[PDB]
Coordinates of C-alpha atoms and ligand atoms in Angstrom, one line a residue:
Chain A
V41 CA -75.6 -55.6 -49.3
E42 CA -75.9 -51.8 -49.8
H43 CA -73.6 -49.4 -51.7
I44 CA -73.2 -45.7 -51.2
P45 CA -71.8 -42.7 -53.1
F46 CA -68.1 -42.0 -52.4
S47 CA -67.0 -38.6 -51.1
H48 CA -64.7 -36.7 -53.6
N49 CA -62.6 -34.4 -51.5
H50 CA -60.5 -33.0 -54.4
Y51 CA -57.1 -31.2 -53.9
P52 CA -55.6 -29.2 -56.8
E53 CA -52.5 -30.7 -58.4
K54 CA -50.0 -28.4 -56.6
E55 CA -51.7 -29.1 -53.3
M56 CA -51.2 -32.9 -53.8
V57 CA -47.5 -32.3 -54.6
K58 CA -47.1 -30.1 -51.5
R59 CA -49.0 -32.6 -49.4
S60 CA -47.2 -35.7 -50.6
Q61 CA -43.8 -34.0 -50.2
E62 CA -44.5 -32.9 -46.6
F63 CA -45.7 -36.4 -45.7
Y64 CA -42.6 -37.9 -47.2
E65 CA -40.4 -35.5 -45.2
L66 CA -42.4 -36.3 -42.0
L67 CA -42.1 -40.1 -42.4
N68 CA -38.5 -40.0 -43.6
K69 CA -37.6 -38.8 -40.1
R70 CA -38.9 -41.9 -38.6
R71 CA -36.2 -44.0 -37.0
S72 CA -36.2 -47.1 -34.9
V73 CA -35.1 -45.8 -31.5
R74 CA -33.9 -48.2 -29.0
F75 CA -33.6 -45.7 -26.1
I76 CA -37.0 -44.7 -24.7
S77 CA -38.1 -42.5 -21.8
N78 CA -40.4 -43.7 -19.0
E79 CA -42.5 -40.6 -19.4
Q80 CA -46.2 -41.4 -19.7
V81 CA -47.9 -41.1 -23.0
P82 CA -51.5 -39.7 -22.9
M83 CA -53.9 -42.6 -23.4
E84 CA -56.0 -40.5 -25.8
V85 CA -53.0 -40.4 -28.1
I86 CA -52.6 -44.1 -27.8
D87 CA -56.2 -44.6 -28.5
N88 CA -56.1 -42.4 -31.6
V89 CA -53.1 -44.1 -32.9
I90 CA -54.7 -47.6 -32.6
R91 CA -58.0 -46.3 -34.1
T92 CA -55.9 -45.1 -37.0
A93 CA -54.3 -48.5 -37.4
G94 CA -57.8 -50.0 -37.3
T95 CA -58.8 -48.1 -40.5
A96 CA -56.6 -50.4 -42.5
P97 CA -57.9 -52.6 -45.4
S98 CA -58.3 -56.3 -44.7
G99 CA -59.0 -59.3 -46.9
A100 CA -62.8 -59.8 -47.1
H101 CA -63.2 -57.1 -44.4
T102 CA -62.3 -59.4 -41.5
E103 CA -60.3 -56.7 -39.6
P104 CA -58.3 -59.7 -38.1
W105 CA -56.1 -57.7 -35.7
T106 CA -55.9 -57.2 -31.9
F107 CA -53.8 -54.5 -30.4
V108 CA -52.8 -55.3 -26.8
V109 CA -51.4 -52.4 -24.8
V110 CA -49.4 -53.2 -21.7
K111 CA -48.9 -50.4 -19.2
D112 CA -48.2 -52.6 -16.2
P113 CA -44.5 -52.6 -15.0
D114 CA -44.6 -56.2 -13.8
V115 CA -46.1 -57.9 -16.8
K116 CA -43.9 -55.5 -18.9
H117 CA -41.0 -56.9 -17.0
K118 CA -42.2 -60.5 -17.4
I119 CA -42.6 -59.7 -21.0
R120 CA -39.0 -58.4 -21.0
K121 CA -37.4 -61.4 -19.3
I122 CA -39.3 -63.8 -21.6
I123 CA -38.1 -62.0 -24.6
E124 CA -34.5 -61.8 -23.4
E125 CA -34.2 -65.5 -22.4
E126 CA -35.1 -66.7 -25.9
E127 CA -32.8 -64.2 -27.5
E128 CA -29.9 -65.6 -25.5
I129 CA -29.8 -68.5 -27.9
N130 CA -26.5 -68.8 -29.9
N149 CA -26.4 -57.1 -27.5
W150 CA -29.0 -59.5 -26.1
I151 CA -30.2 -57.0 -23.5
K152 CA -33.4 -55.0 -24.3
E153 CA -33.8 -52.4 -21.6
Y154 CA -36.5 -50.4 -23.4
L155 CA -39.1 -53.1 -22.8
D156 CA -38.9 -51.9 -19.2
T157 CA -38.4 -48.2 -19.6
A158 CA -41.1 -47.6 -22.2
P159 CA -44.3 -46.5 -20.5
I160 CA -46.2 -48.7 -23.0
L161 CA -45.8 -52.0 -24.9
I162 CA -48.1 -52.5 -28.0
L163 CA -48.3 -56.2 -29.0
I164 CA -50.2 -56.8 -32.2
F165 CA -51.9 -60.1 -32.7
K166 CA -53.2 -61.7 -35.9
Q167 CA -56.5 -63.6 -35.7
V168 CA -57.0 -66.9 -37.6
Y182 CA -54.6 -63.0 -46.2
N183 CA -54.5 -62.0 -42.6
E184 CA -50.8 -61.7 -42.1
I185 CA -50.5 -59.2 -44.8
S186 CA -53.7 -57.4 -43.6
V187 CA -52.3 -57.1 -40.0
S188 CA -48.9 -55.9 -41.2
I189 CA -50.5 -53.3 -43.4
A190 CA -52.3 -52.1 -40.2
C191 CA -48.9 -52.1 -38.3
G192 CA -47.4 -50.0 -41.1
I193 CA -50.3 -47.5 -40.6
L194 CA -49.7 -47.7 -36.8
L195 CA -46.0 -46.7 -37.3
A196 CA -47.0 -43.8 -39.5
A197 CA -49.4 -42.8 -36.8
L198 CA -46.7 -42.9 -34.1
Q199 CA -44.4 -40.8 -36.2
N200 CA -47.1 -38.2 -37.0
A201 CA -48.0 -38.1 -33.3
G202 CA -44.3 -37.6 -32.4
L203 CA -43.8 -40.9 -30.6
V204 CA -41.1 -43.4 -31.2
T205 CA -40.7 -47.1 -31.1
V206 CA -38.7 -49.9 -32.5
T207 CA -40.4 -52.5 -34.6
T208 CA -39.8 -56.1 -33.3
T209 CA -41.4 -59.3 -34.4
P210 CA -40.5 -61.8 -31.6
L211 CA -42.1 -64.9 -33.1
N212 CA -41.5 -68.1 -31.2
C213 CA -42.1 -66.0 -28.1
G214 CA -45.7 -65.7 -29.2
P215 CA -47.2 -68.7 -27.4
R216 CA -45.7 -67.7 -24.0
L217 CA -46.8 -64.1 -24.5
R218 CA -50.2 -65.0 -25.7
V219 CA -50.6 -67.2 -22.6
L220 CA -49.1 -64.5 -20.3
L221 CA -51.6 -61.9 -21.7
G222 CA -54.6 -64.2 -21.7
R223 CA -55.3 -64.3 -25.4
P224 CA -57.6 -66.8 -27.3
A225 CA -55.0 -69.0 -29.1
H226 CA -56.5 -68.3 -32.6
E227 CA -54.3 -65.2 -32.1
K228 CA -50.7 -65.4 -33.2
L229 CA -48.4 -62.7 -32.0
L230 CA -47.1 -60.6 -35.0
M231 CA -45.3 -57.5 -33.7
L232 CA -44.2 -55.8 -30.5
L233 CA -43.7 -52.1 -30.3
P234 CA -42.3 -50.5 -27.2
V235 CA -43.8 -47.0 -27.4
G236 CA -42.8 -43.7 -25.7
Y237 CA -40.7 -40.6 -26.0
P238 CA -37.0 -40.9 -26.9
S239 CA -34.7 -40.4 -23.9
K240 CA -32.1 -37.6 -24.0
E241 CA -29.2 -40.0 -24.8
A242 CA -31.1 -41.7 -27.7
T243 CA -29.0 -42.5 -30.7
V244 CA -29.7 -44.1 -34.0
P245 CA -27.1 -45.8 -36.2
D246 CA -26.1 -43.8 -39.2
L247 CA -27.9 -45.5 -42.1
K248 CA -29.0 -44.2 -45.4
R249 CA -32.2 -45.1 -47.2
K250 CA -32.1 -46.3 -50.8
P251 CA -32.6 -43.6 -53.4
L252 CA -35.9 -43.7 -55.2
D253 CA -34.2 -45.2 -58.2
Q254 CA -33.3 -48.4 -56.3
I255 CA -36.8 -49.0 -55.1
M256 CA -38.8 -48.0 -58.2
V257 CA -39.2 -49.2 -61.8
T258 CA -41.4 -47.4 -64.3
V259 CA -42.7 -49.0 -67.6
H260 CA -43.8 -46.0 -69.7
Chain B
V41 CA -21.0 -49.3 -37.3
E42 CA -21.3 -45.5 -36.5
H43 CA -24.0 -43.9 -34.3
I44 CA -25.6 -40.4 -34.3
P45 CA -27.7 -38.4 -31.9
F46 CA -31.4 -38.8 -32.5
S47 CA -33.1 -35.4 -32.8
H48 CA -36.5 -35.2 -31.0
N49 CA -39.6 -33.3 -32.0
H50 CA -41.0 -30.9 -29.4
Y51 CA -44.8 -31.5 -30.0
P52 CA -46.6 -30.6 -26.7
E53 CA -49.3 -32.9 -25.5
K54 CA -52.3 -30.8 -26.7
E55 CA -50.6 -30.7 -30.1
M56 CA -50.1 -34.5 -30.1
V57 CA -53.8 -35.1 -29.3
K58 CA -55.0 -32.8 -32.1
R59 CA -52.5 -34.2 -34.5
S60 CA -53.3 -37.8 -33.7
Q61 CA -57.0 -37.0 -34.1
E62 CA -56.7 -35.2 -37.4
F63 CA -54.6 -38.2 -38.8
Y64 CA -57.2 -40.7 -37.6
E65 CA -60.0 -38.7 -39.3
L66 CA -58.0 -38.5 -42.5
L67 CA -57.2 -42.1 -42.7
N68 CA -60.7 -43.2 -41.5
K69 CA -61.9 -41.7 -44.8
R70 CA -59.9 -44.2 -46.8
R71 CA -62.0 -46.7 -48.6
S72 CA -61.0 -49.3 -51.2
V73 CA -62.5 -47.7 -54.3
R74 CA -63.3 -50.0 -57.2
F75 CA -64.2 -47.3 -59.7
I76 CA -61.2 -45.3 -61.0
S77 CA -60.9 -42.4 -63.5
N78 CA -58.5 -42.6 -66.4
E79 CA -57.1 -39.2 -65.5
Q80 CA -53.3 -39.1 -65.3
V81 CA -51.7 -38.6 -61.9
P82 CA -48.7 -36.3 -61.7
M83 CA -45.6 -38.5 -61.8
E84 CA -44.0 -36.4 -59.0
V85 CA -46.8 -37.3 -56.7
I86 CA -46.4 -41.0 -57.5
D87 CA -42.7 -40.6 -56.8
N88 CA -43.5 -39.0 -53.4
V89 CA -45.7 -41.8 -52.2
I90 CA -43.3 -44.5 -53.2
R91 CA -40.5 -42.5 -51.5
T92 CA -42.6 -42.4 -48.5
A93 CA -43.2 -46.1 -48.6
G94 CA -39.5 -46.7 -48.8
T95 CA -39.1 -45.0 -45.4
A96 CA -40.4 -48.1 -43.8
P97 CA -38.5 -50.1 -41.2
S98 CA -37.1 -53.4 -42.5
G99 CA -35.6 -56.4 -40.7
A100 CA -31.9 -56.0 -40.8
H101 CA -32.2 -52.8 -42.9
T102 CA -32.5 -54.9 -46.1
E103 CA -35.2 -52.6 -47.6
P104 CA -36.4 -55.7 -49.6
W105 CA -39.1 -54.1 -51.7
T106 CA -39.6 -53.1 -55.4
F107 CA -42.4 -50.9 -56.5
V108 CA -43.2 -51.4 -60.2
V109 CA -45.3 -48.7 -61.8
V110 CA -47.1 -49.6 -64.9
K111 CA -48.3 -46.6 -67.0
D112 CA -48.5 -48.4 -70.4
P113 CA -52.0 -49.1 -71.6
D114 CA -51.0 -52.3 -73.5
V115 CA -49.2 -54.0 -70.7
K116 CA -51.8 -52.9 -68.1
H117 CA -54.4 -54.6 -70.3
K118 CA -52.1 -57.7 -70.6
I119 CA -52.0 -57.5 -66.8
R120 CA -55.8 -57.3 -66.6
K121 CA -56.2 -60.3 -68.9
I122 CA -53.9 -62.4 -66.8
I123 CA -55.6 -61.5 -63.6
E124 CA -59.1 -62.0 -64.8
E125 CA -58.3 -65.4 -66.4
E126 CA -57.1 -67.0 -63.1
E127 CA -59.9 -65.6 -60.8
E128 CA -62.4 -67.0 -63.3
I129 CA -61.8 -70.3 -61.6
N130 CA -64.6 -72.0 -59.6
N149 CA -67.6 -59.8 -60.0
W150 CA -65.1 -61.6 -62.3
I151 CA -64.5 -58.3 -64.1
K152 CA -61.9 -55.9 -62.8
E153 CA -62.3 -53.0 -65.2
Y154 CA -60.4 -50.6 -63.0
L155 CA -57.1 -52.3 -64.0
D156 CA -57.7 -50.8 -67.5
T157 CA -59.1 -47.4 -66.5
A158 CA -56.8 -46.5 -63.6
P159 CA -54.0 -44.4 -65.1
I160 CA -51.3 -46.2 -63.1
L161 CA -50.8 -49.7 -61.7
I162 CA -48.4 -50.2 -58.7
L163 CA -47.0 -53.7 -58.3
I164 CA -45.1 -54.3 -55.1
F165 CA -42.5 -57.1 -55.0
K166 CA -40.9 -58.8 -52.0
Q167 CA -37.2 -59.6 -52.7
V168 CA -36.4 -62.9 -51.1
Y182 CA -38.9 -61.0 -42.1
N183 CA -39.3 -59.8 -45.7
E184 CA -43.0 -60.3 -46.0
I185 CA -43.9 -58.3 -42.9
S186 CA -41.4 -55.7 -43.9
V187 CA -42.9 -55.2 -47.4
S188 CA -46.5 -55.3 -46.1
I189 CA -45.5 -52.7 -43.5
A190 CA -44.3 -50.5 -46.4
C191 CA -47.5 -51.1 -48.3
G192 CA -49.4 -49.9 -45.3
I193 CA -47.4 -46.7 -45.4
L194 CA -48.0 -46.5 -49.2
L195 CA -51.8 -46.6 -48.6
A196 CA -51.6 -43.9 -45.9
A197 CA -49.6 -41.8 -48.4
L198 CA -52.1 -42.4 -51.2
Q199 CA -54.9 -41.3 -48.8
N200 CA -52.9 -38.3 -47.7
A201 CA -52.3 -37.3 -51.4
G202 CA -56.0 -37.7 -52.2
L203 CA -55.6 -40.7 -54.4
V204 CA -57.6 -43.9 -54.2
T205 CA -57.0 -47.6 -54.9
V206 CA -58.1 -51.0 -54.0
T207 CA -55.6 -53.3 -52.3
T208 CA -55.2 -56.6 -54.0
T209 CA -52.9 -59.6 -53.5
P210 CA -53.0 -61.9 -56.5
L211 CA -50.1 -64.1 -55.4
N212 CA -51.3 -67.0 -57.6
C213 CA -50.5 -65.2 -60.9
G214 CA -47.5 -63.4 -59.4
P215 CA -45.0 -65.6 -61.3
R216 CA -46.7 -64.9 -64.7
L217 CA -46.6 -61.2 -63.9
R218 CA -43.0 -61.3 -62.6
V219 CA -42.1 -62.9 -66.0
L220 CA -44.3 -60.4 -67.8
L221 CA -42.8 -57.5 -66.0
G222 CA -39.2 -58.7 -66.5
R223 CA -38.3 -59.1 -62.8
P224 CA -35.7 -61.5 -61.3
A225 CA -36.9 -64.8 -59.9
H226 CA -36.1 -63.7 -56.3
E227 CA -38.9 -61.2 -56.4
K228 CA -42.3 -62.6 -55.4
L229 CA -45.3 -60.4 -56.1
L230 CA -47.1 -59.2 -53.0
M231 CA -49.7 -56.5 -53.8
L232 CA -51.2 -54.8 -56.8
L233 CA -52.7 -51.3 -56.3
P234 CA -54.5 -49.7 -59.2
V235 CA -54.2 -46.0 -58.5
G236 CA -55.9 -42.8 -59.6
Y237 CA -58.8 -40.5 -58.9
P238 CA -62.2 -42.0 -58.1
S239 CA -64.9 -42.0 -60.9
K240 CA -68.0 -39.7 -60.6
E241 CA -70.1 -42.9 -60.3
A242 CA -67.8 -44.4 -57.7
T243 CA -69.6 -46.0 -54.8
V244 CA -68.3 -48.1 -51.9
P245 CA -70.2 -50.8 -50.1
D246 CA -71.7 -49.5 -46.8
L247 CA -69.5 -51.1 -44.1
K248 CA -68.6 -49.9 -40.6
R249 CA -65.2 -50.5 -38.9
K250 CA -65.0 -52.0 -35.5
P251 CA -65.2 -49.5 -32.7
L252 CA -61.9 -49.1 -30.7
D253 CA -63.1 -51.6 -28.0
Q254 CA -63.2 -54.4 -30.4
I255 CA -59.6 -53.9 -31.6
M256 CA -57.9 -53.0 -28.3
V257 CA -57.2 -54.6 -24.9
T258 CA -55.5 -52.6 -22.1
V259 CA -53.9 -54.5 -19.2
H260 CA -53.2 -52.0 -16.4
Ligands
LIG301 C1 -40.1 -57.2 -39.3 C2 -39.1 -56.4 -38.6 C3 -38.5 -56.9 -37.5 C4 -37.6 -56.1 -36.7 N1 -36.9 -56.6 -35.6 C5 -36.0 -55.9 -35.0 C6 -35.4 -56.5 -33.8 O1 -35.7 -57.6 -33.4 N2 -34.5 -55.7 -33.2 C7 -34.2 -54.4 -33.6 O2 -33.4 -53.7 -32.9 N3 -34.8 -53.9 -34.7 C8 -35.7 -54.6 -35.4 N4 -36.3 -54.1 -36.4 C9 -36.0 -52.7 -36.8 C10 -34.9 -52.6 -37.9 O3 -33.7 -53.0 -37.4 C11 -34.9 -51.1 -38.4 O4 -36.1 -50.8 -38.9 C12 -33.9 -51.0 -39.6 O5 -32.6 -51.3 -39.1 C13 -33.9 -49.7 -40.3 O6 -33.8 -48.7 -39.3 P1 -34.9 -47.5 -39.1 O7 -36.2 -48.2 -38.8 O8 -34.5 -46.6 -38.0 O9 -35.0 -46.7 -40.4 C14 -37.3 -54.8 -37.2 C15 -37.9 -54.3 -38.3 C16 -38.8 -55.0 -39.0 C17 -39.5 -54.4 -40.2
LIG302 C1 -54.7 -58.7 -48.5 C2 -55.9 -58.0 -49.1 C3 -56.4 -58.5 -50.3 C4 -57.5 -57.9 -50.9 N1 -58.0 -58.4 -52.1 C5 -59.0 -57.8 -52.6 C6 -59.5 -58.3 -53.9 O1 -59.0 -59.3 -54.5 N2 -60.6 -57.7 -54.4 C7 -61.2 -56.6 -53.8 O2 -62.1 -56.0 -54.4 N3 -60.7 -56.1 -52.6 C8 -59.6 -56.7 -52.1 N4 -59.2 -56.2 -50.9 C9 -59.8 -55.0 -50.3 C10 -60.8 -55.4 -49.2 O3 -61.9 -56.0 -49.7 C11 -61.2 -54.1 -48.4 O4 -60.1 -53.4 -47.9 C12 -62.1 -54.4 -47.2 O5 -63.3 -54.9 -47.7 C13 -62.4 -53.2 -46.4 O6 -62.9 -52.1 -47.1 P1 -62.2 -50.7 -47.2 O7 -60.8 -50.9 -47.7 O8 -63.0 -49.8 -48.1 O9 -62.1 -50.1 -45.7 C14 -58.1 -56.8 -50.3 C15 -57.5 -56.3 -49.0 C16 -56.4 -56.9 -48.4 C17 -55.9 -56.3 -47.1

């Protein structure tokens, strides 16, 4: 099938530095926030963020992802109680599943797992950039119940669940440091 | 242990819309580019996108990733030779492994896989934002040969290989469209 010229779009050296630095600083401020307002997020913003995620690479171009957005208080609650019950197995309370205006549940269609996670990574970058917060959760083993609850095809496995909204006034984050560059990076020169 | 106040943004809605749009347009221009110049990339810029990737969330804050950056022509060729040999099994040439100034090999240290793939997603966003190109590859079959070649511990499994640089003048991309939003998104209201 057909092949077309690729658009250059060339930044000068110092522009790339400035741009890559700013993006690091923007994303370095991302934190998983477990305290989330019930304020509504504009659907446009949610659309744009999911579009952005959909621009991810995928193995053999399958785009094997489904982003399920839950705005309904009742199913959000059912989702909440389902998640809590399983986590009670030997704190266990997740309130933000209710308080967040939106739950985004990412499903993988059946190297798709990697492809879908790559997209989720892009989604999180998109949330940060848009000034929204979430906390990444991967409630596997709850997938079958949630897939059924949400009416999904069964060749879909749940991958990730992101409560999405604005941080509430009392929001805190634990005090954690990220590894320095030298503990994530090896260069062979 | 200790907890700190999370400091919010202030982006007003109209700003969030515009920002989310701009970011979608930026990332929508990302294509896997199989034709890559041998022009050196500024090392600072490479540092910044790896730093950015290291800002990813990880399960239990383990930050279980290692980004190996190969700038040495000999070992990059050795890398090319290994990769081509295996995929020859029943096009076959990946020349860009030689021509690209830099190869980035991401290892999972053993939900580590999802965590590392999330970071890789953020890495791709960062490359795009910096005006660099790549093609995502996941040669897990020859991963142990490369782990040994690259002198990494046995508890690191290879995940992804990104050749990284500027696109060639002759660089094309196949002509593909992404799914429209309504093929990736379901909203239950
Ligand atoms: C695959 C994955 C699963 C996660 N699951 C949970 C979870 O069940 N509960 C939770 O509170 N955080 C979860 N997190 C978030 C991590 O706890 C958080 O990212 C990490 O502690 C670092 O904090 P930060 O994201 O604010 O930088 C998960 C993160 C990843 C990548
Ligand atoms: C897990 C994974 C593995 C991939 N492996 C290859 C590969 O071996 N060779 C290749 O040319 N592209 C590979 N790709 C790139 C995809 O072919 C490419 O992303 C997809 O066709 C969509 O095109 P785009 O990235 O330009 O939007 C891979 C992508 C993913 C997510």
